[PDB]
Amino acid sequence: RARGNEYQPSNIKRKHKHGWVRRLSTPAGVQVILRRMLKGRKSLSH
Amino acid sequence: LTYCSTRKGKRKTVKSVVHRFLRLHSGLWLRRKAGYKKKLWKKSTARKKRLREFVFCSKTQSKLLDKMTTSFWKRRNWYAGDPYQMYHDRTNLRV
Amino acid sequence: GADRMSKWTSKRGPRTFTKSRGAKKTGIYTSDRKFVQIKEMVPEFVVPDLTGFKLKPYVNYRAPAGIDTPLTAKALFQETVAPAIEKDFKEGTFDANNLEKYGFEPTQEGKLFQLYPKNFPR
Amino acid sequence: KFVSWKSRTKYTVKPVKMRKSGGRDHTGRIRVHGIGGGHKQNYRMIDFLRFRPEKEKAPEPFEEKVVVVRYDPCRSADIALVAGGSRKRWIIATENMKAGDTILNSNHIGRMAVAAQEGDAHPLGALPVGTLINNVESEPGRGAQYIRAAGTCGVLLRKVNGTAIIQLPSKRQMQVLESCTATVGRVSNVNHNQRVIGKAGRNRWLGKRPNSGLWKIRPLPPMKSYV
RNA sequence: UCUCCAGGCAUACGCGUAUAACAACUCGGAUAACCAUUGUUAGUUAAUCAGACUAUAGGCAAUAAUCACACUAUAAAUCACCUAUAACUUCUCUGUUAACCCAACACCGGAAUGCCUAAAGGAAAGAUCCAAAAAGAUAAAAGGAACUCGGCAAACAAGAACCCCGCCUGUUUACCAAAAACAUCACCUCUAGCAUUACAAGUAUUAGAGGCACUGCCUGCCCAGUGAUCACUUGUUCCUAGGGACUAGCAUGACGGCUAAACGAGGGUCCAACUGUCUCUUAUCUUUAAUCAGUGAAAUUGACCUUUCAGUGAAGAGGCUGAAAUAUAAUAAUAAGACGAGAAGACCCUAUGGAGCUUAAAUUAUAUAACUUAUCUAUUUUAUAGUAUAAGUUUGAAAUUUCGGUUGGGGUGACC
RNA sequence: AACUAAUCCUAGCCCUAGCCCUACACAAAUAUAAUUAUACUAUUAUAUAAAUCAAAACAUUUAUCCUACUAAAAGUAUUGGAGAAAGAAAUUCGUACAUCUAGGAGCUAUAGAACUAGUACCGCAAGGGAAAGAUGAAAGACUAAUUAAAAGUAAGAACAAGCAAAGAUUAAACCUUGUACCUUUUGCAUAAUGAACUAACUAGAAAACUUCUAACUAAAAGAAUUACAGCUAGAAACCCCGAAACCAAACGAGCUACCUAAAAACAAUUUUAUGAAUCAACUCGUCUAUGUGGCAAAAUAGUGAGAAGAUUUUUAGGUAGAGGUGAAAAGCCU
Ligand SMILES: [Mg+2]
Ligand SMILES: [Mg+2]
Ligand SMILES: [Mg+2]
Ligand SMILES: [Mg+2]
Ligand SMILES: [Mg+2]
Ligand SMILES: [Mg+2]
Ligand SMILES: [Mg+2]
Ligand SMILES: [Mg+2]
Ligand SMILES: [Mg+2]
Ligand SMILES: [Mg+2]
Ligand SMILES: [Mg+2]
Ligand SMILES: [Mg+2]
Ligand SMILES: [Mg+2]
Ligand SMILES: [Mg+2]
Ligand SMILES: [Mg+2]
Ligand SMILES: [Mg+2]
Ligand SMILES: [Mg+2]
Ligand SMILES: [Mg+2]
Ligand SMILES: [Mg+2]
Ligand SMILES: [Mg+2]
Ligand SMILES: [Mg+2]
Ligand SMILES: [Mg+2]
Ligand SMILES: [Mg+2]
Ligand SMILES: [Mg+2]
Ligand SMILES: [Mg+2]
Ligand SMILES: [Mg+2]
Ligand SMILES: [Mg+2]
Ligand SMILES: [Mg+2]
Ligand SMILES: [Mg+2]
Ligand SMILES: [Mg+2]
Ligand SMILES: [Mg+2]
Ligand SMILES: [Mg+2]
Ligand SMILES: [Mg+2]
Ligand SMILES: [Mg+2]
Ligand SMILES: [Mg+2]
Ligand SMILES: [Mg+2]
Ligand SMILES: [Mg+2]
Ligand SMILES: [Mg+2]
Ligand SMILES: [Mg+2]
Ligand SMILES: [Mg+2]
Ligand SMILES: [Mg+2]
Ligand SMILES: [Mg+2]
Ligand SMILES: [Mg+2]
Ligand SMILES: [Mg+2]
Ligand SMILES: [Mg+2]
Ligand SMILES: [Mg+2]
Ligand SMILES: [Mg+2]
Ligand SMILES: [Mg+2]
Ligand SMILES: [Mg+2]
Ligand SMILES: [Mg+2]
Ligand SMILES: [Mg+2]
Ligand SMILES: [Mg+2]
Ligand SMILES: [Mg+2]
Ligand SMILES: [Mg+2]
Ligand SMILES: [Mg+2]
């Protein structure tokens, strides 16, 4: 079958998988935020 | 070998050489004969005599042994009662 | 393929996602799914009577402006409280206990307009 | 995130809704293979302690009335609703129970044997030796745990002192005190094993997934030659 | 106004101003017209459509659904109502546009539900010409598989029978394999006597692991031998070649041919009909092609003023040796050569380069499972129970590492 | 007789010296699907770093990594498949520039930071990550000039014959002579690799021993060292690009595999009473042709299989790499 379309957008899924509350839930996710703050990223999370 | 060490930045001596040879200040090296303690029961009386001796080294072996030791092992030593006192110098050598 | 940079508002997302644009609440929601407005929660504008008022938006260019002197706690105390205490002290009828006589308030509780924590808006 | 559905705290006769597992632990990984799907089912709480005196009542034998004998999705045997006093509760149903019958639950270890009618619960000591029984209890007051399947019965082989020997359906003998209750008679649905599934689709209804496609005596040194 | 075509309108999810007017004519639409582009100004209005929406504590449930009546069946199946406590008149907030989303694109692709099938929605041809080759459709004298690896494809046909394999409906290598493989009802072997997170709110007619077509039908033999429920001879044990004890609470098994009707985009064989498959090709229309106008890519490329024949050569010469030919440039065609271009195309060998798998390779292995000795408690008169740990022994789930050389490539041999 | 182009100088940066810090930025909003004025429902890093790699393999072992004052004792004592390698202390020495808030035989737009910016853009996510500017004192003087100057073109197509040139010649071509370049092969190529052209960028580094040039000399050296002509100082040296792998910690089940919960679709006809039949919707993908930088990184046109069930479909949740899932294809996990 034809590939290239694996992104089936859904806002509820997007915010739960990669969102702010999700990142802060574990210590590993909190360190993800710290790295992006040190680099200077304008977007810390979805 | 180590040409430049991390802690001091110097060359290092290969200690397996120091445990097998003796260096006379002129530049000669002395060694034993391989096998001089092995299976003596099967060796003739003339063969055993040759093994007991102290022997010199060739020019190429002397060159290699010099590279593998540092200068400290090449200095003048004044040992009272030295049994090698008379062999540290050369006499009547045209060369 | 989603946009990470634009702001998250209620126009976006599915139906069940909603949030406010910053307007203050004016009532309560009960069970039975009924909204009940509270009258005291609706702000009331206190507008003065402007009849016969001499002041207008602009001022004449010939009016002299004055040297700037921001008000300080010291200045307010001298103008209002200092004179009364000075007269009483000369008469000798002054004591620390009765500072309330001169306008001191021990605590802000009970006042309609509390100065800390502020309980009224602008 | 997995939370067990077995959270209800109070006994009732109303059906309870069940959640299936799929063979997965609370971690979420498969632990048992071959489980998945099936028909939706409701749980009816069965009371396995036959001699439970009612609230604010003395501990002497009482009787109860058989209201129904009903099919149960969660077992191989069938169940019966029984009412006595002002209380109703589910129990297991023996081979020949019928609606409207009256049944006896006893607390009395008769010095002599008590005449036994199918379905009544008596302490093991009273019953004569050789009388078939089921819903056996290992320890007094624990609640029945053995021989509660369809068409299965045990035998009271022997009694000495205050301890009796029971023969389980597997024929492995077992022993227990004589003060633990048991109910006489074989369990219902004696012909359960005779069923024929017929087609593959029927197993999928029961909640069974298909098998997988994938398809030690070490000799001693003197045995190496003739391996 | 005419000629022809036939999935449209709403909601959900998603998107985020692409919406409408005016003005521009740079960039964007693969070209113009016109805008989907650029700039400026505007827009979507709800107590009913849609979202969010905190009084408290107790008590309690046998009787599906399908027009639910009849009717059975099996897979056993959607808060209410009461008892007391407390409160005692209210409308704010948010969604609402469009030619639209996921696929690098104004992509012949993918995309849930309700109503309806033309009353809704649309345009296959920029202009001209009528060549070859290529693609698609339709018609064809006489013959009817002679075609071909094969009736592939096509047909005014779309039917019949038999053989191999598998029982059957199902599943599988997304992007070279759909099958004879996998699963499957049926049948058989092994392990387990028990509760508060799987198995399971279950208990041997139960649960887990594994094998295997079913069905009937031949082939069924390690019971201790002979006497005959009885005596000896055996066998297995003890006590000393003697003397006792035990063997009467049971009693074989292992293959073949079978198939069985049905079923199959499975692999073969055959008959009939049918036909441009063929003898042997032809005609017409559409797409392409060619000419005019607009916009405008890709692999490729040491330099080239880029000829034929014989010889030489590494099966090899446009360019070297010897002969010969020879005004200069375009447009449309053929595919012999330029060992023509892109091949992530395959076979052979090497490296003290790797990885996956299997063990009977070497080295370990508080994964489990057992024990033993201490230690710490209990008791006990030494003694049996247990055990937050240490040291041994037994099992081995796993872990790390390696694959000498010359003998064509193997296969047995050898050899250093 | 000129188009395309070219010329430029400062934005900032780099390495040291010095010094702790007290920077913690109106109102309002934010840990809820962050940036939503008020109760529901509690909140909390980590047991020893490993492997690559060296030992020309590999299994004990392998500097820094894993920091404790300079100079010396000393690469000495010691440790080590006693081998690759590793390596002290006792004991001596030292107040150091000390406003040096300063310096440069450091870079100047392909350099120096990735930076005009962690932006645009790419990825579900962790994450990856660019390009470029130039008048003058005044533009309230119409934006300045300067250059036969790169490749590429134009002005100006071509004229028997040939690695394109050389000897020549009155004469551009005619006559004579002449088997492209680098690397690799057996010192050989009409063999075979590599190159469309222009501009910029793009690869040999250390002082044990030796030789040369000086100072002083039985002594040399500005403390610790060497010496039977020595000792001290100077000068003289050993490349670039390219794997399949292995280990640690994050990030991924919006695709696909299987499961949980809540929902949904199935016309007409014949049978019956069903994993039955014919055949749409819908799901799948047998066979042939077209297409092959395609409309499409797997499609289109026909033709085919199932179509009340082990059926198909939607929404939300779960299982994670020493792993998961699997009607086993060593299939699938963006
Ligand atoms: Mg993508
Ligand atoms: Mg199998
Ligand atoms: Mg518009
Ligand atoms: Mg207009
Ligand atoms: Mg517009
Ligand atoms: Mg409403
Ligand atoms: Mg609520
Ligand atoms: Mg609308
Ligand atoms: Mg695409
Ligand atoms: Mg396209
Ligand atoms: Mg219309
Ligand atoms: Mg035309
Ligand atoms: Mg025809
Ligand atoms: Mg004909
Ligand atoms: Mg033929
Ligand atoms: Mg033929
Ligand atoms: Mg055909
Ligand atoms: Mg089959
Ligand atoms: Mg099938
Ligand atoms: Mg599957
Ligand atoms: Mg395939
Ligand atoms: Mg098939
Ligand atoms: Mg296929
Ligand atoms: Mg099979
Ligand atoms: Mg088939
Ligand atoms: Mg025929
Ligand atoms: Mg044209
Ligand atoms: Mg020519
Ligand atoms: Mg020739
Ligand atoms: Mg020639
Ligand atoms: Mg050709
Ligand atoms: Mg061609
Ligand atoms: Mg070629
Ligand atoms: Mg080798
Ligand atoms: Mg190796
Ligand atoms: Mg290796
Ligand atoms: Mg190595
Ligand atoms: Mg020291
Ligand atoms: Mg730069
Ligand atoms: Mg840069
Ligand atoms: Mg030029
Ligand atoms: Mg010429
Ligand atoms: Mg080659
Ligand atoms: Mg090339
Ligand atoms: Mg250059
Ligand atoms: Mg999912
Ligand atoms: Mg999906
Ligand atoms: Mg129907
Ligand atoms: Mg498929
Ligand atoms: Mg069929
Ligand atoms: Mg069909
Ligand atoms: Mg069907
Ligand atoms: Mg296989
Ligand atoms: Mg295989
Ligand atoms: Mg991938």
Between the first and last Cα atoms of chain D, what is the distance in angstroms? Answer: 55 Å
Q: What ligands can be seen in this structure?
A: magnesium ion
Number of strands of chain B: 3
- Name the beta content range of chain B: 5-15%
Structural class of chain B: alpha+beta
Helix coverage percent of residues of chain B? 10-25%
Instruction: Name the helix and strand elements of chain B from N-terminus to C-terminus, one letter apiece.
Output: HEEHEH
* Beta-strand share of residues of chain D: 15-25%
Total helical segments of chain B = 3
End-to-end Cα distance of chain B: 33 Å
Helix/sheet category of chain D: mainly beta
Number of strands of chain D: 12
The greatest inter-chain interface is formed by: A-C, 8 and 8 residues
> How is the main sheet of chain B built?
3 strands, antiparallel
Large-scale geometry of chain B: extended
How is the largest sheet of chain B built, in terms of strand order?
1-2-3
Order of helices and strands of chain D: EEEEEEEEEEEEH
Q: Profile the largest sheet of chain D.
A: 6 strands, antiparallel
Subcellular location (chain B): Mitochondrion
GO molecular function (chain B): structural constituent of ribosome
Family (chain B): Belongs to the bacterial ribosomal protein bL35 family.
Protein name (chain B): Large ribosomal subunit protein bL35m
Structure summary:
This is part of a larger assembly, with chains A (46 residues), B (95 residues), C (122 residues) and D (227 residues). Chain A is 54% helix and 0% strand.
Describe this structure in words.
This is part of a larger assembly, with chains A (46 residues), B (95 residues), C (122 residues) and D (227 residues). Helices cover 21% and strands 7% of the residues of chain B. Chain B has three helices and three strands; from the N terminus they run αββαβα. Chain B has a three-stranded antiparallel β-sheet, with no helix packed on it. Chain B starts with 14 loop residues before the first helix and ends in a 28-residue tail after the last helix. By secondary structure, chain C is largely without helices or strands. Chain C has two helices and two strands, in the order E-E-H-H. Chain C has a two-stranded antiparallel sheet. In chain C, a hairpin with a 3-residue loop joins strand 1 and strand 2. In chain D, the strands form three sheets. Chain D has a six-stranded antiparallel β-sheet, with no helix packed on it. Chain D has a four-stranded antiparallel β-sheet with strand order 5-4-3-6, with no helix packed on it. A two-stranded antiparallel ribbon of chain D has the order 1-2. In chain D, strand 3 (62-70) and strand 4 form a beta hairpin. Chain D is globular. At the A-C interface, helix 1 of A face loops of C. One magnesium ion is lined by residues 213, 215 of chain D. Residues 213, 215 of chain D line the site of one magnesium ion. The PDB classes it as ribosome. Keywords: mitochondria, ribosome, large subunit, assembly intermediate.
